Amino acid sequence: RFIQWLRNWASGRDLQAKLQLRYQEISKRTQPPPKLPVGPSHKLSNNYYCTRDGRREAMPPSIVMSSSEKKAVSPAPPIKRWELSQDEPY
Amino acid sequence: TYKYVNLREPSMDMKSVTDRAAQTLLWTELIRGLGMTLSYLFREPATINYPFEKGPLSPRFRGEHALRRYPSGEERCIACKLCEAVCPAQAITIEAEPRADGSRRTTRYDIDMTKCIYCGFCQEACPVDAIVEGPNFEFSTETHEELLYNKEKLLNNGDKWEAEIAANIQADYLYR
Amino acid sequence: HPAAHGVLRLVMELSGEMVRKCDPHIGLLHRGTEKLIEYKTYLQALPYFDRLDYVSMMCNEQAYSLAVEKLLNIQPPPRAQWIRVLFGEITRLLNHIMAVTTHALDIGAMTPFFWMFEEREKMFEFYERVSGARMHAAYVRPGGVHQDLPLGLMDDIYEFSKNFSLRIDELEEMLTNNRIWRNRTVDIGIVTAEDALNYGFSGVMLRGSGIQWDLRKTQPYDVYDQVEFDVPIGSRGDCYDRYLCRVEEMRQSIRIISQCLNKMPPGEIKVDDAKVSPPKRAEMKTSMESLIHHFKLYTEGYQVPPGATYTAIEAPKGEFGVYLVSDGSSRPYRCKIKAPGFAHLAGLDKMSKGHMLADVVAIIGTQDIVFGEVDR
Amino acid sequence: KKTTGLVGLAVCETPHERLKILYTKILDVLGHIPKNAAYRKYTEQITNEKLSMVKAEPDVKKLEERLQGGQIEEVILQAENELSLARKMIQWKPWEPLVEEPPASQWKWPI
Amino acid sequence: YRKVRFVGRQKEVNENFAIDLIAEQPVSQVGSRVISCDGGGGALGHPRVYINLDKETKTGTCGYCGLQFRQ
Amino acid sequence: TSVKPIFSRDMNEAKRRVRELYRAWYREVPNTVHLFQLDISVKQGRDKVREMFKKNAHITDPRVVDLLVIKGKMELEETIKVWKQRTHVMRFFHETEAPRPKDFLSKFYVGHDP
Amino acid sequence: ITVDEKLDITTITGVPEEHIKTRKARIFVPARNNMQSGVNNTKKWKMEFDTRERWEN
Amino acid sequence: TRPTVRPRNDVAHKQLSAFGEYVAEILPKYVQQVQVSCFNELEICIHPDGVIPVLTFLRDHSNAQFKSLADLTAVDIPTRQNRFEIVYNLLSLRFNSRIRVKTYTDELTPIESSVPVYKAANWYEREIWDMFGVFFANHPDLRRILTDYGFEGHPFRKDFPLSGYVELRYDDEVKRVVAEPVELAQEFRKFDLNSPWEAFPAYRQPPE
Amino acid sequence: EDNKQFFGRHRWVIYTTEMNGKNTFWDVDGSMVPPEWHRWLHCMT
Ligand SMILES: CCCCCCCCCCCCCCCCCC(=O)OC[C@H](COP(=O)(O)OCCN)OC(=O)CCCCCCCCCCCCCCCCC
Ligand code: SF4
Ligand code: SF4
Ligand SMILES: [Zn+2]
Predict the structure, then answer these.
(1) N or C: which end of chain D has fewer CB within 10 A?
(2) What residue's CA is closest to ligand 3, atom 6?
């Protein structure tokens, strides 16, 4: 009609992606009952606390404090640069 | 990696520079969008026409409080003093004292409705599964002498709809 | 009106026209935070990290929940993290929908606001379906994500994402090369120096200014390493090349949300070891061991060993700190938060001397200063 | 190159002799410090090994690798200031021994 | 003294009362020794607790549940 | 005690200082008293200033007497300018607050165990 | 360097109000709640003040 | 152990042993202790003398850059006999590392401003004067940020009872909005969470 | 309820008169809906 392409005379054209989704193509509801699995070492006869151990780990290891061919060691290697990452990088 | 944006140079040749002098002086741009991308009004408005129509939600929503009771009623709360002790804001206030038969229940239970920050920490600590955030935004009265709740305001406010509540948990309780 | 969803009172002595002086008064929103987080346990005190800023929600707490798992020597299970990329990188679509617009409501336009917030809504559902609430939603925890997400959302994330790169093409034809805007911003508030580092600025007003560094790919977070993206960069240090990051940084995200829907492996959600995670409502409700770790876990907290940390992230407008001492028992000790707003606004007075007054309204908008955060 | 890269700088101009001024300028001044404190044993040791790479290869581009700075024009400003400390370093005196150990129980963390 | 606050305000109070609403229940029986009290339906209700009825005539309703229970 | 003092050295340059900024206060009470459009007897404004400077009298030490100053040196910034709106000032002179007994038998009929 | 030794018993004044001289603090070792046998709630000398009236609202 | 326990990494912990070995080597007039946090971070315990000095060495060098100042903060500890603490925190852009610099103090002893070294300690030093009370000399400006114009208590230290000493309320008897002592409507209940048995053996305090 | 040709304005309601001790019509608030439809009109299910 005469108002359909006068919406298409500007901003290119869409007619597929449209702001209000109001029409169909949505998700309906939660129909199914789900079941959430428990995997991670949940079983018996083996899983034993004191091998899984999340916590109980030591105090911060010291270094020489009060009471040699050094290369001027830096804390780590310096950073190598980045690419220019072809996408349309200009 | 990287990218470089706003790094470009004009071409500088008389096939171009007209195209940039047919722009400044004739306004060939700046009517491109707002001569057009504005209109583009011909789309259906998006409005939820309020007093009647209303918008979406989910079964996990949070809001006005309640206290359920089983079938023939026990006042499901046992006064185990938990939904009180995880409360960040410290709204809750509970005073038990042994009821006549010898089963324990409450006396004073007061959720302040100004302090409550709407966690979802008092829906999730109750082991006997009493206290439950309702899905009704009914609120807004005209005096702060009010929103403080007692016990016997809550129960009704939670027996006014239990057809709302008792059908949400049985959607949601299979996840947690 | 030009408060930018916040409250400030700044005072300038201008010279007849040019400002040449500014000295703002912050401290209108202080509220008294870090004095009140010594008094609350670990899981009880979480939200007061969500309520700090108003815009980024799951990106906070991603910076607390990563500053606790450390002191505990514990990692989330694999399906934990690959959530925290999907929400973690979906709220970078929030602060970049705001800071291109509610900045440019000061420049005076209308539609680039009433045109977008049609959409910033379609996202707020996805905070409501996943857990509860409209904005502030307490979901991430010390143990990875709270509870699983419904059957759904993966046909409401996919269907929504493939529509979105168009709307970001209605903020482009409406802005970039529109002259009256180009002229409101170019070569305005240029800090190109190595003071723009010396002040210790965070991300953008860096990466848009040359000096090239980001905390997403120089440090891993939570599996962030396994997806590919490129960090846009700017030419000259003015504002309109700190804008142009925030478009080409909304067109990178839709790469990751699109790259991260394909990989999410099935698995549990909470940390497994159960001293730091509560159990389900099937387990606490029958066997015995599942109270004494659900009924001492909702009064006192974890027991998190003493010793100090620090940590950092890339929040949509810049870094976010937590410097978390802990005394070796349940309630913390200093929890010191730093967010930008002690840099990006430390550098207004410097940046703007020599331009008019009607610029200083449009300088602020580019730092993305949002307050109650300067509760720092 | 026309773009200084990391912005705030400008390319002027001379490479290959602009560094050599400064390292040499560093090495001479640096010697006036007493020789005990390792500061010379390090502050110099990086410069000589650095200078070995300087002399000599084209283009300036392949001077970049094996000398990890930023771009060359920046490496100057890396070498510029390392002086401005040295010629202070004699003002206050690091090399001297330690002063005022804290009151003997201070850094012990769990109170 | 206190009583002048709800004047004209109609004083919300709880029409039903559970102080005892319990005793109307047909107190059950089993014919066995110890029982499982999980109430109100599976996985909505009190945690499972087993009670012994051997007295003569009594029972014990676990005290979460309240519902009069015996043999 | 060995730590570097702040400004003063012992008690004299110090007690030259407290004498000093007194006048900056004493010379400027009243320009405000017309500026905020607050109404009081201008002599009140010269009683309080002299009521405060006599208050902390027992101070035995430098670096205390310099510490207090650094507070006192500040206020003349705000007050001689307008960073307060009438209600950060007048709070000095407490209008509304009902009197305290401070005597004995007036307590014993009101309040438990102070 | 201005080391300037002296001795004045350290005190500080003006920050609180009348609660300087009115009250009496107390320094005491907590006593172990006796319903349980855990001995680790001891070991730090705290302090806590006098208690004044709480009334009803 | 693997599945739920955070996998460690050694390499990061070897170097930050070295590179921190020798900044106790070349500035022994100042640095009085150094160590390695089990998570691969460093803490340099420095006398209060060097503050401007040490950073200035950390300010520029070819072996340690540390140009980016991130977070200044404080902690206040009673029964440390020198109350407060500072913690500087600095990122070296080239070498990808964090090294924190701890310097103690008191209230009365001044500390000297870092402002000419970095211009980003301009605010972070104005703040601390408000909160804890530490007094930074030779600071281009010293004023009141984060707090109202009335607080004479310097709150975040450990002696300020949480609710401050004066509530505020407005009355119409005149005009103003005036300040009457704090009267609450609820006690602010004090719970008590600290459980016995000492669950951590590794941190076990000295036997005594 | 509309034909399922809209989203969010597809489900709507009508108020009529004097529910419970109520003013007649031109007073309409929206707390009136029976506590069942909160499981319907709000699109919770
Ligand atoms: C032989 C016969 C003669 C032959 C002659 C050939 C043709 C010559 C006639 C051309 C004259 C046309 C009108 C005059 C030119 C337009 C006015 C103009 O020059 O604008 C220049 C303006 C300056 O911008 P600039 O130099 O780039 O500096 C900013 C850099 N940041 O750059 C600009 O773009 C400013 C744009 C206008 C500013 C306001 C726009 C606001 C929106 C209003 C648009 C609505 C008007 C549409 C007309 C409606 C008519 C019914
Ligand atoms: S509901 Fe759960 S928490 Fe609230 S009182 Fe009854 S038992 Fe204690
Ligand atoms: S609702 Fe939120 S705030 Fe109110 S009590 Fe339950 S948890 Fe505490
Ligand atoms: Zn039962």
Answers:
(1) N
(2) B122
Q: How was this structure determined?
A: cryo-EM
CB C320 within 8 A of CB C376: no
The total number of structural domains in chain C stands at: 1
For residue E66, how far is its CA from the centre of ligand 4 (angstroms)? 7
Q: Are C320 and C60 in contact (CB under 8 A)?
A: yes
CA–CA–CA angle I41, I42, I45 (5° rounding):
85
- Helix (H/G/I), strand (E/B), else coil: B133: strand
Angstrom distances, CA of residue C246 to CA of C241, D2, H37: 9, 27, 37
b (16+ CB within 10 A) / e for G15-54: eeeeeeeeeeeeeeeeeeeeeeeeeebeeeeeeeeeeeee
Would you report the helix, strand and coil content of chain I in percent, each value rounded to 5? 5, 0, 95
Cβ of residue C183 lying under 6 Å from some atom of ligand 1? yes
d(CA H48, CA H110): 10
* Resolution of the coordinates, Å: 5.0
Whole-angstrom distance, CA of residue H116 vs CA of residue H56? 10
Give yes or no for a contact between H141 and H126, defined as CB atoms under 8 angstroms apart: yes
H32: CB partners within 8 A, 6+ apart: A65, A66, D98, D101, D102, H45, H46, H47
Listed by start position, the domains of chain F span 1-114
For chain E, give me the number of helices (H) and strands (E)? 0, 2
| CA angle in degrees (0–180, nearest 5) for C144-C150-C156 | 105
Extract the tokens encoding H198.
Answer: 């000492």
Dist CA H127 CA C342 (whole Å): 11
**DSSP codes joined into one string, B70-113:** -SS---S----S-TTTT-SS----EEE---TTS---EEEE---T
CATH code, domain carrying C283? 1.10.645.10
Atom of ligand 3 nearest to the CA of B92: 5
CB atoms within 10 A of CB D8: 20
Residues D81, D87: Cα–Cα separation, whole Å: 10
* Rounded-to-integer distance, Cα B159 and Cα B146, Å: 20
Is D68 in Cβ contact with A72 (below 8 Å)? no
For residue H138, with 0-12 CB atoms within 10 Å meaning exposed, 13-18 middle and 19 or more buried, which class applies?
exposed
Strand pairing class (H41-46; H68-69): unpaired
Instruction: Select from B30, B32, B38 the residue to mutate for testing ligand 1; criterion: most ligand atoms less than 8 Å from CB.
Output: B30
DSSP alpha helices (H): ranges in E1-71? none
Q: Which residues contact H146 (CB under 8 A, 6 or more apart)?
A: C26, C27, C30, H127, H130, H131
What the block records as the tokens of H139 is 């600071």
Is the N-terminal amide bond of H148 cis, ω within 30° of 0? no
- Amino acid, single-letter form, for residue D70: G
Q: Which two tokens stand for residue C152?
A: 């759904």
B80 is in an annotated binding site: yes
Q: Count of B–H CB contacts within 8 Å?
A: 4
How far is residue C176 from each of residues B26, B29, C179, C189, C206, measured CA to CA in Å?
A: 19, 11, 8, 18, 21
Assess contact for C357 and C12: CB atoms under 8 A. yes
Amino acid, single-letter form, for residue H118: Y
Name C101's Cβ contacts closer than 8 Å, sequence gap at least 6: C112, C113, C116, C117, C171
C-to-E residue pairs, Cβ atoms closer than 8 angstroms: 9
3-state secondary structure of C127: helix
I28: which residues sit within 8 A by CB, 6+ positions away?
B51, I15
